[PDB]
Structure formats: structure tokens, C-alpha cells
Amino acid sequence: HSRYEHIPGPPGRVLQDVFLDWAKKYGPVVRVNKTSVIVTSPESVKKFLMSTKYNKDSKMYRALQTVFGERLFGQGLVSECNYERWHKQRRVIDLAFSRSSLVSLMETFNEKAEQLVEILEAKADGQTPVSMQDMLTYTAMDILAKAAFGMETSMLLGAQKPLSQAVKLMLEGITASKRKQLREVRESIRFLRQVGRDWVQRRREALKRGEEVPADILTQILKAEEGAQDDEGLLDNFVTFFIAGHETSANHLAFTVMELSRQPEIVARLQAEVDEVIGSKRYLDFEDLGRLQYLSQVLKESLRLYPPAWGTFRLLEEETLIDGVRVPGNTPLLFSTYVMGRMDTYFEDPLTFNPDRFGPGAPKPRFTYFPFSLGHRSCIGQQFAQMEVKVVMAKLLQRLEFRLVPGQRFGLQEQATLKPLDPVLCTLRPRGW
Ligand code: HEM
Ligand SMILES: O=C(Nc1cc(-c2cnco2)cc(C(F)(F)F)c1)c1cccc(Cl)c1
């Protein structure tokens, strides 16, 4: 008998959907086959995520650390599982995500969002198909590169297609872990790290010549590595931020645009809100963001049904009773905001898209909703992400109407993160048509 055999479990669709079916059938503690245990009670979410006693399970993060023998995220901020090592770097990099730091990024967010809208407006003939997944990804990449690194990827101009291909193949590599695929994945990872080395060299050379370098994420990434023996830790975090800083944001934007294409009444309300708050202004100030209350709620509801980062793992070190189930020591505990978001025990009519769930008067979900995770290992980029997505969405809503091309699906794919299966192909018209 397996050490886990006694635990309840089985004897456009994703693995997370199978997990949801099993959680509904088998209850709050379910074995899935490494063997992990999916824990879906809010009591468990609170117990394990809100304590520094419980740390990430390194075995479950190996696929981010190294892919086919090529160091990827290595021991960067996401994939480092040793508390003390993580804590040291977290505290330093946190400085780049202060309120004042993020306020300064509004210029970048505005400029890239405006560039996107202008590109889209020229195609708004109600006929030309536009992949909103692609366009939102390019926007997210361009935002990240500029905001975090002071680098112009110019993906919105159709530049850096090799870099684009490298990201794609790398993401495929994470999932995979024959002949040509290994070659393409390995070279793509080395490419991304090389991008890092090139840019860090440029930064250091600029600093030496006494040129102006605005403090950014890269500043703190460098700071975290002060007096390191090599640059491998630095490049770990370069790649971590390069990828994490755009991928989930892009996914979230794509899901939101996809969902809203079948929510005309919600779209009408969103259009009205932007009209009242910002009017025809070309630029959103920081104070405008807080005023976009209904948009905030829509984006929260989007993350409930469509969290790009579906959850997290913690290592259970000692045998523990969890919701009446004996769980052996040395076991990965799997938490899923995707699963809990779709369980009727936690959310009434879970498949209904209802922004009012996040309304001012509504009881806030208690440990049943965590698209940015919870506790010490929550997303460092949460406020960064929320700001940039609000800027992008507000400008789209100001200027454009979108219709999803018939045949386009609302299904998901799972490729390290969750994202729309289809390209979110739309036709566009200017608002007032
Ligand atoms: C809507 C967009 C985003 C979502 C849904 C999201 C979600 C998450 C989640 C669920 C985690 C926990 C991951 C885990 O436990 O394995 C996480 C961690 C992280 N995210 Fe994000 N994220 C987003 C945007 C960003 C952005 C914009 C950045 C950087 C600019 C970023 C960088 C990170 C980093 C570095 C971590 C690791 C934090 C730590 O452990 O100290 N994310 N994010
Ligand atoms: O792949 C995992 N996490 C992941 C997170 C992010 C992220 C977080 N914040 C912003 O982007 C981005 C990525 C990607 F590289 F695909 F873009 C992957 C992973 C690996 C092992 C276990 C678990 Cl639970 C999750």
C-alpha cells in the first residue's frame, strides 16, 4: 500500500478541470498523481498560505528552475524555495514596488496603451480579424521591458520576432518537462539569458560613463546580487521578471477581452464609467485608476474564473490531519484558486460572470479567492499588474468596440500558465459607430 492510498481520490479543457471534478467528488483533501494532495478548504488555505512555517516545495518548482539541462528561472524570486534565501532577495526587490515607484510607471503604462489603441483604431473596419491575445501580449511585453529594464522591445512595431519565438518555445519547454524540440527549447533559454547578460552589460556601462539611469526593477535585481560570486543569480531574476512581468498580465488581459465579448451590458457600463471618469483624456493619471471602480470589479471577477497562475504548492513536513484526512509527512500540498473559484460551495452560480460579487457592499471571499496567492509568497507584482491592466483596459473601452469572430472559443489551454485556447480573434469598430 502506497503511503497515500488511504486518501480520497480517483482509482478547451485543462488538468485544472479534472482537479475541480475530483474536488467536488472526493472532497477537500484529494490525492492526485509525483503524488500531491489538493487541499481546497478555506481553513487549509488560511493555515498553510498565511504562515512562514510552510514553504514552497522545491520538487514542484524544478520545471521553472531548469529545463532540459538549461537554467531558466534558477533560484530567482518565484522559484527559490529556501525561506532565508528568498527573504533576502524579496526585501531588496520590494523597494522597486513601493507606491512611489509604481506611480512613476504611469507614463510607460499610458504610452504603450496609447500605442496599442492607435494601432487597433487603424484596423477598426469591422472586417479585419485581429488577434487580441497577440496584441495584448506584445503590449504587455513592451510595457514590462521599458518599465522594469528601460529597454524598448518594440513588439508592437513588429520588432524582436526572434525574442518572441524564444519566449514561445521556452513556455512550451516548461510544459514538456524529441530531437529538434530539445534543440529549439535549449537555444531559446540560452537566448533569453543572453538578452539579460547583454542588457546588464549595457546598464553597467551606462552607470560607469555617468549617464542617467532611472531606478527600476533592474536596479534592485542588481542590488540583491551585490557581492555575489557570479552573475547567475542576477540572470535568474532578469529572466524571472522578463517572463513573469508580462505573461500573466497578457493572459489576464486576453481572458478579460474574450469574456467581455459576450457581456454587452457589462461592456456598456464599463464604457459609461470611463466616459464619466476620464472622458476623452488621452492620459490616465494615477488618481483616475481608483475611480474606475466597476472596472476593478470586472477584473476581479475575470481573475476568479480565469486565474493565469492557478495556484501554488507548499511542502508539508510532518504528518498532519487536514479536514479529517491523515496526510503523511513530506507531501506537496496543491492549492488552486481556479478550482475553488468554480466550486458552488464557495461561489453561488460559479460559472456566472457577475462583477457585483466584488461590489462595495458584498461580503468579501474569505480564503476562497487568491489569483495573486496569499501570504509571504504572494505576487510581488500584484499592484504593478493591476495598474497596467486597468490602463490598457480603460483605453480600449474609451476608444473601441470589439466583436469576437464567430467560431472563436472561450476554452482554456494550460501552458505553464492558463490562457485562452484561441487567439481571441476580433473585429473592431471605433466607439460611436
Ligand atoms: C495579472 C497578473 C499577475 C498574476 C495573476 C500573478 C499571479 C501570481 C501568483 C499566483 C504568484 C504566486 C506564484 C507561486 O506561488 O508559485 C505570483 C508570484 C510572483 N509574481 Fe506574479 N502575477 C501577475 C503579475 C506579475 C507581474 C506584473 C510581475 C512582475 C512585474 C510578477 C512577478 C511575480 C514574482 C516575482 C512572483 C514571486 C514572488 C515571491 O515569491 O516573492 N507577477 N504571481
Ligand atoms: O510555471 C509556474 N509558474 C509561473 C508563474 C508565473 C508568474 C507569476 N507571476 C507572474 O507570472 C509565470 C510563469 C510563466 F513562466 F509561464 F510565464 C509560470 C509554476 C511552476 C511550478 C509550479 C507551479 Cl504552481 C507553477
| Binding-site annotation, residues | 379
Residue that the C-alpha cell 462583477 belongs to: 355
The domains found in the chain, sorted by start residue, are: 17-430 (1.10.630.10)
Nearest listed ligand to the Cα of residue 170 = 2
Q: Within 6 Å (CB) of ligand 2, which residues are found?
A: 60-61, 63-64, 78, 171, 174, 243-244, 247-248, 309, 311-313, 379, 416-417
DSSP, res 135: H
- Give, in degrees to the nearest 5, the angle at Cα 67 between 62 and 71: 85
What method did the depositors use to determine the structure? X-ray
Nearest CA to ligand 2 atom 6: 244
- Which residues are within 8 A (CB) of 94 and not within 5 positions of it... i.e. 6 or more apart? 220, 380
| Whether the Cβ atoms of residue 177 and residue 67 lie closer than 8 Å to each other | yes
Are 385 and 379 a contacting pair, CB within 8 Å? yes
Closest ligand 1 atom to 308 CA: 5
Pocket of ligand 1 (CB under 6 A): 77-78, 90, 240-241, 244-245, 248-249, 252, 308-309, 312, 371-373, 377, 379-381, 384-385
Give the number of the ligand closest to the Cα of residue 387.
1
Q: Which three cell numbers stand for residue 144?
A: 514590462
Nearest to 143 by CA among 397, 388, 417: 388
CA distance 411 to 419: 9
Resolution (A): 1.7
Distance from C-alpha of 318 to C-alpha of 3, rounded to nearest angstrom: 13
Euclidean distance between CA atoms 371 and 304, whole angstroms: 7
Residue 427, CA distances (Å) to 155, 284, 389, 391 in order: 21, 25, 21, 21
The answer to whether the CB of 304 falls within 8 A of the CB of 371 is yes
CA atoms within 13 A on the CB side of 87: 7
CA distance 366 to 42: 7
Quote the CA–CA distance of 34 and 244 in Å, as a whole number: 25
Alpha carbon of residue 178 to chain centroid? 29
Write the burial class of residue 210 (CB in 10 Å: 0-12 exposed, 13-18 middle, 19+ buried).
exposed
Residue with cell 473601452: 397
Q: How far is ligand 2, taken at its centre, from the CA of residue 64, in Å?
A: 7
d(CA 429, CA 433): 7
> Rounded CA gap, 227 and 223, in Å?
9
CA-CA-CA-CA torsion sign (341, 347, 350, 356): negative
Helices (H), 263-405: 264-277, 286-291, 293-305, 337-341, 382-399
Query: Which residues are known binding-site members for heme?
Result: 379
> What type of residue is 300?
K
For residue 170, the ligand 2 atom closest to its alpha carbon is 15
Ligand 2 pocket test: pick from 236, 417, 418, 419 the residue with the most ligand atoms within 8 Å of its Cβ: 417
Please report the atom of ligand 1 found closest to the CA of residue 389.
1
Between vectors from CA 91 to CA 85 and to CA 92, what angle results, nearest 5°?
A: 95
Largest separation between any pair of C-alpha atoms in the chain: 67
- Can you say whether the dihedral through the CA atoms of 412, 171, 156, 107 is positive or negative? positive
CA 67 to centroid of ligand 1, rounded, Å: 20
**CA 80 to ligand 1 center in whole angstroms:** 13
Residue (of 200, 155, 192, 352) closest to 266 by Cα position: 352
SS (H, E, C) 195-257: HHHHHHHHHHHHHHCCCCCCCCHHHHHHHHCCCCCCCHHHHHHHHHHHHHHHHHHHHHHHHHH
Residue of 248, 252, 314, 418 best suited for mutating to test ligand 1, as the one with most atoms within 8 Å of CB: 248
Phi, psi of 30 (to 5 degrees): -135, 135
